[PDB]
Every structure is written in C-alpha cells, then in structure tokens.
Design a protein around this ligand. Sequence first.
Ligand SMILES: NS(=O)(=O)c1ccc(O)c(NC(=O)NCCCCO)c1
Ligand SMILES: [Zn+2]
Length: 257
Amino acid sequence: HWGYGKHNGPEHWHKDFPIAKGERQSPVDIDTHTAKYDPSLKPLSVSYDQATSLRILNNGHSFQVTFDDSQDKAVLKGGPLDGTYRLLQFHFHWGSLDGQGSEHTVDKKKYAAELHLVHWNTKYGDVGKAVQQPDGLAVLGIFLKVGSAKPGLQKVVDVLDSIKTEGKSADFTNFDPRGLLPESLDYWTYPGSLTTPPLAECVTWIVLKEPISVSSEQVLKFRKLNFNGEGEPEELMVDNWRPAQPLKNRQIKASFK
Ligand SMILES: NS(=O)(=O)c1ccc(O)c(NC(=O)NCCCCO)c1
Ligand SMILES: [Zn+2]
C-alpha cells in the first residue's frame, strides 16, 4: 500500500500510479516573483453558510471531515472557476517539526501544515466522475503557521483522541468551516493534480496567500494521530506531505499585485 515511509513514500508512487511523472502534478513551489498578476481573475466566492458536516475519519494518511454534498449547501465559485463547486471534505497535511509539513511551498519556504478544502464541479454530477475531468475539482489550500491559537480549529483538535488509528470515525455535525479561513482571500492558482494517489490531473488549485496561525498545542494534537490501525505497531502520523513537483509547462497566476 502506498504511504509516506522510506519504502512506500512519494518516490515510489510512480510504480503503481505512473501519472506521478505527468505534466500537471501537484504540489509545486510558488515562486512569488515569477507568478503573474492576472487582472481578469475574479474574487473568490466562498458560500459556506449552509454547510452540513457529517463525520470525521482517520483514513490512514490524514484525517478528514466530510460534508453533505447532495445539494448546493457549501459551494465555491468565482476566482478562476467556471460554474459551481460543492464542498465534499477537508483534511490536512503536516510535519514532525514546525519547519515542514506543507505541500505547496512559497519561495521554497515550507509551512508547518496545509489545509485542503476539496470541492467538485457540479456539472459532472458526482465526485467520481469529476476526478476524470481536467476541470473536475477545485482545492482551496491554506497554509498553517505556528503562533496564536485558531479558535475555529479547536473543535477539530478536541475530537482527534477519538480517531487515533486508521479506520476510526466519529460524528462531527454542526462544524462551521468558515472558522478556518484567513482574513484575505487573495490567491495563486494553477492547474494541477491530487497530491495523493491516484494523483489524478483534475484539480484547479487555489492557494491562499495569507496563512492562518495555530498554536503549538493544536499542531501537537495532529502529531499524536497514528498511521497504523488499532492493534498494530505504532507509527505516528507525521510528515504526510508530498514534496514539490516540476512545474513543467505551467504558469502560476496571482489574483493580487
Ligand atoms: N491532497 S488533495 O490533492 O487535496 C486530494 C483531494 C481529494 C482526493 O480525493 C485526494 N486523494 C485521495 O483522497 N486518495 C485516497 C486513496 C484512494 C486512492 O486509490 C487528494
Ligand atoms: Zn490534501
């Protein structure tokens, strides 16, 4: 099974998923001086007021919060996107130490963690069909730095002890994802891929310029999760990030000067 260890980690994934060496893989390093301001880019429209969270789950590579995506309840529109994208889930990637953990980098700088809010294009009817299309998904990526606590994250942090090991899930209703967003919605955007297998090249990436701050106690609770299932030798869930991939024939655009 793929993972993040020495023998099954990102350098091995191409053997089962040859698209890993493809033309639009993610994440990438965002060279801020080389990104081009695009004045035709529209502001992002984040409409999360009716979001309905369902469950929180340890899937063996991250933890995720899942939402009801059977109606237009929490949607992303505007920005570089055509049409309406429904929120399906969010999850995080993080490090063993505060100087690594993000997937995207900014001028080679790594953040302590990265939040991915995953949305799919409603014209394709379901996420399984959307992943087969070059414009099927939109992932909003948000960097986390360590400093002051993020109050909107605490409800997530406090339930992690109930999903310590792979396969465990818990009810997680009435969570408001608006509490995870920074003040500014300025962003970079480029066409890319899922950052975990199957590495499908279906994602419009929207990476926010402004990080959110979380406390050392909050990130320490992420690092207490386990990759392994219950009853197996304990391997802490840390460093579940893919390194930056070649930009190849792509340009990163900025919404801001
Ligand atoms: N990190 S990401 O680019 O935001 C991302 C967003 C949505 C996804 O569905 C995946 N990939 C995934 O969940 N794979 C699960 C194992 C099944 C493979 O057989 C990654
Ligand atoms: Zn992710």
